[model samples]
Target: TERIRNVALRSKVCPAETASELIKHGDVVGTSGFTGAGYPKEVPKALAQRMEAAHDRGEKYQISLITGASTGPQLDGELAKANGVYFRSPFNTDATMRNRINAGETEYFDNHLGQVAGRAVQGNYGKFNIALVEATAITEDGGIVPTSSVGNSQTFLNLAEKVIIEVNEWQNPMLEGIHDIWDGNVSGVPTRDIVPIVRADQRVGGPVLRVNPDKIAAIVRTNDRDRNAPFAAPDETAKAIAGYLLDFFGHEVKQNRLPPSLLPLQSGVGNVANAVLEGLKEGPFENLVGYSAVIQDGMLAMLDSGRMRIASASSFSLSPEAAEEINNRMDFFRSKIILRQQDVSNSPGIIRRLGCIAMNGMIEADIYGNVNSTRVMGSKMMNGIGGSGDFARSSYLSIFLSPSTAKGGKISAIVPMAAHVDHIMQDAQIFVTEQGLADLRGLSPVQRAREIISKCAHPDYRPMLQDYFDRALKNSFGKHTPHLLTEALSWHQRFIDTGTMLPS
Candidate 1:
């Protein structure tokens, strides 16, 4: 109860059950959560129970759900299991919710993480009926002090007709001053503008999210923690990818193309990317800066080790041990870490201005360097293209990483042509695999094909790719970028026949 520093609104305290009632059927709901931090933990579960009760009574109960990014089980997993959402937007990675989208039951608009907040604030997805935002404390002047992450709750609250706040007591009370909340909804320049955030560690906003106090319909008090899953150790191949990545950086510095510490780093989410951050620590670089969407365990380690002088991000995707460490050492973390809203952290303008060397993971890459970061075989969506597109397209040096093969050499990460394209060849500046690294800048499509096939493709698939390249050279459909479109898809056809892309 003391979490609500605003004595004026203390009387509005209610149970999770009462808060769930405000979200009616077909209501457009927005909740705060990114990666796995600062989401409404209890209200969503109670909403699932309410919706289940309505279903048993033969009442129609469903709603459209939107968020900053993929949340944890309490909000996404529980509600998705209870059939509480029909339309979901932005991004997600839950297996339970993913099955619904794949099965054609849920309509998901997999959007860019940087664009979601700005568009949600603009009524682009219809009016937001209500928002369930998690907070550490309610300020005396009606401002909401966020917990671990400063997600799109700032923008969502602006559009929310009704706001249900979950003042979580379990969050560290020291988290009050770590966030930098600014209204970053500039529809485009001329019409609107924001102060230029020149440095990665620059603080340009307030510490709390201010809103109309009367709009807060109800406040639910709860004691909970974020989804702090333990990070898995990188395999041999993952370590090799990091090895080649750091080596490539050394070469770039020698060639006078990069700074000694390189540009501010921005990595996409995954174990491989985390391994690279680990590479930075044991290696030569020092005082590196990080500008990305989500900060993970390795970045926290880098911050603690003084390897990373500054880390600015929108959310925390920390491991259990790191989450605990941050709670215990919030005072030290508050000085080095700055949490901005997603739009500011993931903004293309800011990303390009910072000239960040973006390191992202990939599903597969074509010989022409076109990357498939999302879809499986062209039609099926795996996960939404999170901030990869936002950063890859705008960063100083965009790099994609993956192992050369998957399913024990049954599939090659570098295909003849990508089944689906998320980051086009123009955006894919550098490509790396456990086998080797290829810098594709200033190279033609044909040259890129050779570089990718020889360097990035695994040894087993290298010959098969070369054979395709040689045959496609004579009187192909297009000479500027030669491609036998029918032949390009034969590998997938062969895969469907015998789970292997190799010709029988």
Candidate 2:
């Protein structure tokens, strides 16, 4: 009670001192952030700098780092460069941090987004020694109102032995009540009562995040804006992919598999996903809603055009232009948007319950319809699997979108076999590329190979894939699921040796 002061509830301290007192070697630290928004900017940077100094003295100061999803360069990037991260989990997009993981400098656990918080709550993962949470403001009772994203901050606050709050003054005050901090048991099978978020605009949690004051180690104040990077412009390939997906949705509607307006949508954050959202601007879809992990640029435009009624996501991973539009028109978009925890945003129960149309970008898909969202050419790590699996496995329509080729036509995204399988054939219902769409539902593995190769594979790679399938059909024993053990990985190995995937 003595720490509370002024109308702004100025419960504050110095970040450097807090970093010195709380953080230590081998500590498991969890922070608030999802794709750059609502992360502790100053504290993590300070902690990394301190850790670097200690590292120079031949002392090891690596700690296990965890977050809601991929954060900005400050936490994952700077800390990773300083060798402060011993292990990482869930999702990340920073090139520096990705290099560390791929180089075996850091232990990386690629997990489904919905599983991270639950694993932490159950202590299946390491315990949180300290939690760095960002807040727009503190309540009179010392509760913290989050900004931009909820992520897994609530989970960290509840589970961590000590809590350090970062009060970001540059964050818009309007973001105060935008968060819905919901907490449910995540230790085991989700037998808990369903989250009451039936509609996209419903607020199912309290106005602020409640935490025990006794656990508050320090509160630091800083002023910084979130990193709102611009996404790639809508190119020809993106538009074509969007067009194919739009037609597929229409076909689904015609087949009575989807309604006229379609079900709630869960699209990954990127160009193709944004293009699909932008395409909805002129498409026949209406009265739509989004239930995804990140709300991007085109979502605001979709909302403005009156097509998307509401969008519920964990955070706003927006481009510069989109972030400006949202900030300039906060009053207009406030009621139509609801930000929730990442665990809830990507929850399997809610995704299946709402019958979401999960659309995600993929690195590659095999002829048998296995989708790989993480690994590149088998061994290298791209981003983690993210929420793609969480939505794709349980949604009403699980769709993966990507160009048919990469590396200036040197690599075909449609392979005879995926180097790694994040979304297996059984869970993948649809696959789309700039060239065409393939519906894998009700198709056996042998049949899926044909459909994917014929419909989704690039023209240059088609003959090679077809040749493999044809040979496998003739020589392989299984009539339903065919594969040649020796030749299954031929393409990938060829790519490695020749720098091209063309079959010899």
Candidate 3:
């Protein structure tokens, strides 16, 4: 009752089951969530229960889902358990949902996080029927203050015919001022206002999301928190990789290529990414700023330590203890963080304007510097290219990180050719592995190939990669970028044929 400050909205307060009934079969629902935080909790669970009951009675109950990014169990898990989702989109990292996506039971659309809301506005994924959002409070004038992540809810709230908000008492009311809710024109065609944000801490909009009182269909009251996953401490190899990155940054700063504090840093999601952030926290850099999509646990540590001056992102994925620490110090964290819509967080234009330093994880990279970010063996689906492309294509210094080997040296992360390329040779300027860093910036194909093979490849696979490149250089038809066409993808085939990339 305290969270719902709007007296008119208090009349609309209902139970999760009653609120869940508004979602019908085959409806396209847009949800507020990003990297497992600030998602509708009880409403989704109740909807799943209702869906399961309908299935028991032999009734068809399934709906399409659209989201800001990956969501936790309550939203993706509960519905997935009931097999109640007809399709899901944007991005999802839940294993249960991944199994369903891979098994061909559900339709999943891999999309860029920055472009999701704009595409929705342009009616690319069809009209949104409902907007389900999680909030800390509803203002007296009907403005909604989001919990942890803003995501695509602002867009959904504008487009959806009905809106169901989950006012979770578990989320601290202090989160009200962290959101910079602004809807700049983001149509696929020519737009109106430029994304006025030039710096990480700059705020260009209101504090809460404004909604027409008529659009509020139901307000569900509940008490819940996010399902956050913990990260493993940095391993020896991860530490090695982090050290190598530090070495590079030290050199770059010395060379005057990077600033003392460096440009806004963007890191992808993974242990390796966290390891890098942890390193940054302990490193010489200070008063740093973050302009990434997902704020990892290590970034929170930096904020606590005063190493990071500020961090701007669409969402944050934190462990339980970290979330507790944040909730305990909302005033401090809120001052150091600015949560925005995904479009602005990963927007290529804004990233270019700020010259963000893009650092992302990749499955593999070829000798020519092409990056494979989303695949296992070229045919398998690991996950979708979420915001990597948006950052990769437009950032000032693009870096891709991966370990040198996988499967106990059965496979090599450096390949002769990428089986699939989410990033071209021009996309990433630097490639880092546990072994070494390959600075391929401004290098030609031949030079890039040499640097990658010699510097980035592992000891066991170096000779093989060198031998392949050596042969391709001598026996190839083209000299600009040498490659024996028949043998380029044979490594992936070899790993597929046998258990190892080495000779069977």
Candidate 4:
């Protein structure tokens, strides 16, 4: 506090005070937060103080607030009370933010990390008026220490006219190597092979944000608050699912070992994915290379334990301590980490090349191996269907992992018709939750129906699934099996509670 006050006074102008005045009403503000790692805490506070003062002066101020994919409780809460309007993906999962969003108080935008960048770059999401970002260190050559975790902060920092930085000394300086902030080339024509986000060739430059020392209007360095992500243990259902996935991967993966293809590793986020990753640490496999999106705690441990030779992800998301530690080992991890744009991370061709991807579905695996990752009961949309289709289509042997039951054993993931279908029956070859792994690639629809009912169905629904199977497929496959089409539009809903219908 003393250090900051001294700088503010000697600078002849309180940059924090100036930032407050510059953030006018209805301004589209882009804030930063990598879930539990890096975020700007003080600058937003300064903005909120100004808003509160402006309101007291009989001026009604309303600004649209956006963040680069959030995973913590910070500036957004204060921004909301100041009559702010907008928000973006990967926001804080707290009660206040939830209430405001659910009550329709906030106008939110949902798109891929790349789309957000595209919007800002094309000038659709409005001018970068104000960018409040956070980082670990600033090099002598002016290269911003890479802390790209949740959203594309590089785009926000580089695009913004005025920049505000929050440098945390507690953050590891060694983390400089584990980031790849290259621009993606998604022509939509499928040109190059989509590389895994985890790779050696990922960074674009040393000074990515193009902001001069003079343009860095404000610098409020603080080590007061430390952000952390949720790393809680999985529930019983999750444990069961993880156990089965480990068993299958141990056997099937070894049985069909392709060159550099160590079981197509694709699992979603949450306690379930975390638990599965943890289970994988216990399972059978050497050289466990990762080609996924974010590097969670389990993945990091595996990498450190020498099990994983390479890790490819769009970003690295973990608790504050993990980020610091990873950042500290930047040199050792640099070659192992390749951070590309989202398009390359989840491209169809590269996903297929991986061969045996163990992609985890949140809920609603129907009898025919259809996976519904984003909806509940196939009606309302939660998060949009993420990269499931990308990896499932190409992975040589795709494994869909989820718990048989959800909500403390109340809901059954295996259903007659997945209310929504993210990965249609054709995309997925194997299914495993705590219940079992149902292989559907070789079998016909009717045969798949039987296999799922017998192997993957919950104990509570075995008879029911069998009855329905006999009723629907017994007669249908004999003539023409009801082929489930790949229409992501009007897809059925499966997982209602999972946070990954969209927002990766």
Maximum-lDDT candidate: 3
> Which lDDT tens digits does candidate 3 get at residues 87-132?
8988888888888888887888778888898889889878889999
* lDDT, candidates in the order shown: 0.87, 0.83, 0.89, 0.60
lDDT of 1 at 297: 89
lDDT per residue as tens, model 2, 1-504: 222333443544655556545888998988999877888888878888888899789888888888899888778888988888888987888889999999999999977888888798778667889888988888776778888888888888988888888888777777767778775554235676567767667777777888888787888887877886788888888888889988988988999988998999888966777777787888999999988888888887888888999898999888877887877888888777888888889888888988898988999998999988888878899988889888998898899888899888888999878989899987899888888989888988988888899898999999998998898889887867777889888888888899988755
Q: Write the per-residue lDDT of candidate 4 for residues 19-59, one digit (tens) a residue.
A: 56767676776666543445676666677777777778987
Model 3: weakest 10-residue lDDT segment is 183-192
TM-score of 1: 0.97
> How many residue pairs clash in each candidate at the backbone level?
0, 0, 0, 34
Q: What clash pairs does model 3 have?
A: none
Superposition TM-score, candidate 4 onto the true structure: 0.77
lDDT of 3 at 78: 85
* Residue 73 in model 1: lDDT: 82
Ranking by TM-score: 1, 3, 2, 4
Q: Against the correct fold, how does model 3 do in TM-score?
A: 0.97
